[model samples]
Target: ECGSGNFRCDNGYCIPASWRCDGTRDCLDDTDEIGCPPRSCESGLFLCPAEGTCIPSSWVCDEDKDCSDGADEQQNCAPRECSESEFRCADQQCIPSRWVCDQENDCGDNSDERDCEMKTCHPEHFQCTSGHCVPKALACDGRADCLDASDESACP
Candidate 1:
């Protein structure tokens, strides 16, 4: 009598079957993460061992726990390089490093907008009025790096 897209736990709790081996224990007794019988995944899909489901191969090692047993994100996750101007997110996503403090959640998980309480800039860097950081060389160079236009305001 489980709801649609849900798996019945041995303890009588119904959790989304997708949540089963997604690395979190949705079932109260942790039964959803255990005692999974052997099964094969469909073609062109990566089989989640903890739970019996086929997810996209690209989803593996993407920094998100797609497998209930945390294997998808953990297994063979090699670090990939990002451009010098890019910032990598915990979820293996990349965004412009300049956008990190641009007062917008460009990283989708609000990681780009975090810890920006201060507008401190390095001696060689410039701090925008909106707390964004940019190279001092880019300041007042006929471009708008600061959202508030403070860089051009102080141009001599």
Candidate 2:
């Protein structure tokens, strides 16, 4: 039987068509996240750092956390007047403001998410089951982005 608006994964699984690019890993082999087309954002669209995604250019660095991994707000956020944009971490190492609280342990002491104070998601974002908020686009993408997997519930 053919599914209306479904995507075939390399692992021989068919997922919902809307599951693509929603930032969750639906397929067992993660093929759904890897099989996306190249980053060819439309006019006025901004490409995320995580690959296979394009959001509105305005979403970049707005402190709203648009991308699933918060990549949209993770670029070019440091001030340049310090000469090439470097903010000193508590460990006495220089880094960019964009590197802070991006979920990546960039600093040797992991003070990025701590010292900077993790920014909350935008009002338009969906609150994850773990209390962390994510992009509303990630809700019901067939994968569990939330720690409790609440984002995939109650879908029509």
Clashing pairs in 1: 21-67, 21-68, 22-68, 23-68
List, residue by residue over 94-152, the lDDT tens digit for candidate 2.
77765644445677676665733245555677765455556688889999766568789
Task: Give the TM-score comparing model 2 with the true structure, all chains together.
Answer: 0.28
lDDT of each: 0.74, 0.68
Off by over 4 Å in 2: 1-89, 92-103, 112-119, 154-156
Q: What is the TM-score of each candidate against the true structure?
A: 0.33, 0.28
CA RMSD (A), model 1 = 18.9
Regions of model 1 farther than 4 Å from truth: 1-99, 102-106
